From a paper:
Siroheme is the modified isobacteriochlorin tetrapyrrole used by siroheme-dependent sulfite and nitrite reductases (SiR/NiRs) in catalyzing the six-electron reduction of sulfite to sulfide or nitrite to ammonia. CysG is encoded by a gene fusion between a C-terminal SUMT (CysGA) and an N-terminal bifunctional dehydrogenase/ferrochelatase (CysGB). The N-terminal enzyme module, CysGB, is a three-domain bifunctional dehydrogenase/ATP-independent class III ferrochelatase12 that performs the final two steps of siroheme biosynthesis. The C-terminal enzyme module, CysGA, is homologous to a well-studied class of SAM-dependent uro’gen III methyltransferases (SUMTs) that catalyzes the methylations to generate precorrin-210,13.
We attempted to trap the co-sirohydrochlorin product by co-soaking sirohydrochlorin and cobalt. The resulting structure was lower resolution than the other structures and the closed active site that bound precorrin-2 and sirohydrochlorin showed no additional density. The open active site, however, contained a large, flat density that we interpreted as corresponding to a loosely bound product, sitting nearly perpendicularly to the position of the intermediates in the closed active site. Co-sirohydrochlorin was not bound deeply in the open cavity so its density was more diffuse than that for the other tetrapyrroles, but sufficient to assign the central plane of the tetrapyrrole as nearly orthogonal to precorrin-2 and sirohydrochlorin. Then, once metal is inserted, there would be steric overlap between the metal and P133, leading to product release, as captured in the weakly bound co-sirohydrochlorin. Given the differences between the binding poses of the unmetallated precorrin-2/sirohydrochlorin and the metallated tetrapyrrole, we propose a mechanism for product release: steric clash between the metal and the P133 platform induce the tetrapyrrole to break its extensive interactions with the binding pocket, allowing movement of helix 6 so the product can diffuse out of the active site.
Numbering used by the authors:
A (entry chain B): 1 to 269, 278 to 358, 362 to 457
B (entry chain A): 1 to 270, 278 to 457
The structure:
Amino acid sequence: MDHLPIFCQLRDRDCLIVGGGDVAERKARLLLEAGARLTVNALTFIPQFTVWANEGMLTLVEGPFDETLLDSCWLAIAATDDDTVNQRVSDAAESRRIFCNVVDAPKAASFIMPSIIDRSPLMVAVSAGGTSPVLARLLREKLESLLPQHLGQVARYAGQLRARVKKQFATMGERRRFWEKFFVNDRLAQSLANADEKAVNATTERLFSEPLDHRGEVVLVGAGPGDAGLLTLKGLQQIQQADIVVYDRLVSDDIMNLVRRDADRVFVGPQEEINQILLREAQKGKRVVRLKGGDPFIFGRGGEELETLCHAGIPFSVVPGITAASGCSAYSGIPLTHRDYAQSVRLVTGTGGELDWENLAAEKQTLVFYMGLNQAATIQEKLIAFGMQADMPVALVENGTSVKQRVVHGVLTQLGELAQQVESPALIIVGRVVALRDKLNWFSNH
Amino acid sequence: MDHLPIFCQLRDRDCLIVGGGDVAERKARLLLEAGARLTVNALTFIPQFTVWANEGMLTLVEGPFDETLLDSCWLAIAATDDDTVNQRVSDAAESRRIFCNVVDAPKAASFIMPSIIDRSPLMVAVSAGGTSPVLARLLREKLESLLPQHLGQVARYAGQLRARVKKQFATMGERRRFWEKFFVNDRLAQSLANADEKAVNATTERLFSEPLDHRGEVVLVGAGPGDAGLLTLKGLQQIQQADIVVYDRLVSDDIMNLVRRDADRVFVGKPQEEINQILLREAQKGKRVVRLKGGDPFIFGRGGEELETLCHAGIPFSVVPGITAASGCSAYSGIPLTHRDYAQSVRLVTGHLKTGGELDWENLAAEKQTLVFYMGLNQAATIQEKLIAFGMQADMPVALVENGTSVKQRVVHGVLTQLGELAQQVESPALIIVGRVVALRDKLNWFSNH
Ligand SMILES: Nc1ncnc2c1ncn2[C@@H]1O[C@H](CSCC[C@H](N)C(=O)O)[C@@H](O)[C@H]1O
Ligand SMILES: Nc1ncnc2c1ncn2[C@@H]1O[C@H](CSCC[C@H](N)C(=O)O)[C@@H](O)[C@H]1O
Ligand SMILES: [Cl-]
Ligand SMILES: [Cl-]
């Protein structure tokens, strides 16, 4: 260790930045975020500085560097393109024992600016002393994905609870467990973020009433079409705190490889049975994640699985996912809309009735068929027997977003035979947008 | 942010600790190993202080607080159990603009001391600013079993190569591509952890020899509808490593806080073709450009128009899909887009009226579908009249979702004869959902009311 990390309180403390370019502007936005009383001294300023000044948010000293601007300063940052001026800044700062950063030169100054993950009042700082800015940014990117966006509001609210928790929990280890379920209750977190104070002390009273051991809830999490990188940040965070993950065939191996190490897995690849599995594994008092392919509310039966938790008292929440249409669209180079090609996008299945074929053949649509292969020969002639132009571009996307995605494409008179070249899970896309794939194909065809 | 973390260079710089017991000893060990010139001022001391002075590690001043001992100091720590003395020390340090910690009073004074995960020379610092010491500790634990122990040898080796890297690579973009490959090479990390120097050199020399691709790239990234948690892992990865982010008014501020702090940001908020060339000209300067778009880039996003010039131009590009507004607003309002058999199909429609076209209303009025109008607010009264006149029943439930997934989300709902009225009560950005699924809202609404 050759740097000591400290967390400085800068609110209304005099700080100085020397420089007025893009680099200084980024440091000024950091110091403004911390509430510093900011003076910025430069030969000239880019417009973002004069707008900041015209709003009373900092002070501008236009002109050469003047040492006396350090007279009552706590922090100094040299952010000019001129090594000579930066060296005069840092020398003037060192003889005044003002900690100083030189943006181009981390070893030439008395402090180094770390990568910051901001969950105020909780904060994480990562640095390797200027030996590795890229590693720092990589660790920041990781920490940013693991730390829920509203953890800071739980942190702030916990401090307003330290009393009421010791008064009802007289054991160290008992209180260690109350905080442990308190800080991962992200319903309470979102409840605080939304300023829905009826639902806060509702969740709060639940945290003191129910036993410590019981933290029961169900989260519907959309896994996306397969590529593990298409899981949402919130999805990952829920999967990392789950006591039990209920998943099915359509959730990819890559996503499951992200599940908590010490989490129980239930594989369910009849629909009524899945509903019961969710309920009383949540009535066991366990934090349950129901992982589903794509988006849980688009042909996922997510509606059916939650309504069982309704008259049952089990709290739930829903993390949306990248539906198959969106993923296959991006990864095949076929936009679902484009200029005037399509006034609407149609997400359609292929039980409970029969399809309206006149409707689907109407012009200016992008049609996206889910679960359609078993009717792909039927779809073909039924569309051209209801007016659809026989040359309509058509494409099929199998295992979209995955490392084994296959895209076969062509024209509506070939949909039947093209459909034999692909297996479930596949998507059928019909509309002029298909013809754009020749310009926008960037992913690998297998 | 209520604190600014900084990593201070304490070598040969004067620091003062007031107080002489166990809490002071723990802070003094931290400052000795940071390399500081340490003076300790206390009425009473414990053993390790008096050996350290005999061992020449520090200077002891036995007696009451002496504020003149701060005259040359850069940092001060008040670590007595007497809160009156601690306050004198912090008042004396403040008047000299010396950052000061009062150990038992995190909310007072001017810097707090974080808990540290040490990888030498990598370091992660974490604090809740005293507001919740328990959360800090649980987070330390997760970060620990997340940062591999030998990350420090990789970081230490990077620092030894930095002068070689700055010489052989002229531009900063090629230096970045070297580091990105460098920090993800698992064989290099394991060869370092073995002091296997022939293996470290074989891989290092191959890494320097790799002809670096010099083109830039354009990445369309779907921000999702607003909640920063609905950004994808890959979308976060692209903006955490971008050079320039070109972003909309419909990208939320929370997502903009996820953008690489050292990337610059071009705003384009309400020209479709100045955007196309801003991307092109900024890309093949050699830099990674992220075009960050609200929702999903290929659903009413004109993402196709932005990419179509690049292929014939020789510019690589990719697309990261996002959570389209229909999905986000469905999940966050408790209105599933499909359910059992309420809906055979979902229709995402542009409620905008291109100055020449008109929607096909008989088509949209059909039964057993969920209609979702994008940018349809200012024509909501026309949508009401047209759907009704083409056969949709008057009691069809509708909902308008404004700022869906944000903490400012509002949802108003009713039947189709209210749609025109209901739209007067929200502003953009808002979605219109028409269909039987809207009635499920009272059974599936988890997010809030507002
Ligand atoms: N990775 C993928 N590639 C292509 N189609 C997929 C897919 N994943 C799911 N699908 C489509 O979705 C159907 C399952 S229905 C479940 C859909 C899921 N809730 C979603 O939002 O995507 C499959 O028959 C297939 O047509
Ligand atoms: N957070 C939000 N809540 C409700 N509607 C939203 C929204 N964000 C975008 N929209 C809708 O989207 C329209 C812009 S069109 C761009 C949509 C984006 N490409 C996507 O896939 O979602 C707006 O007029 C509004 O109708
Ligand atoms: Cl670093
Ligand atoms: Cl478009």
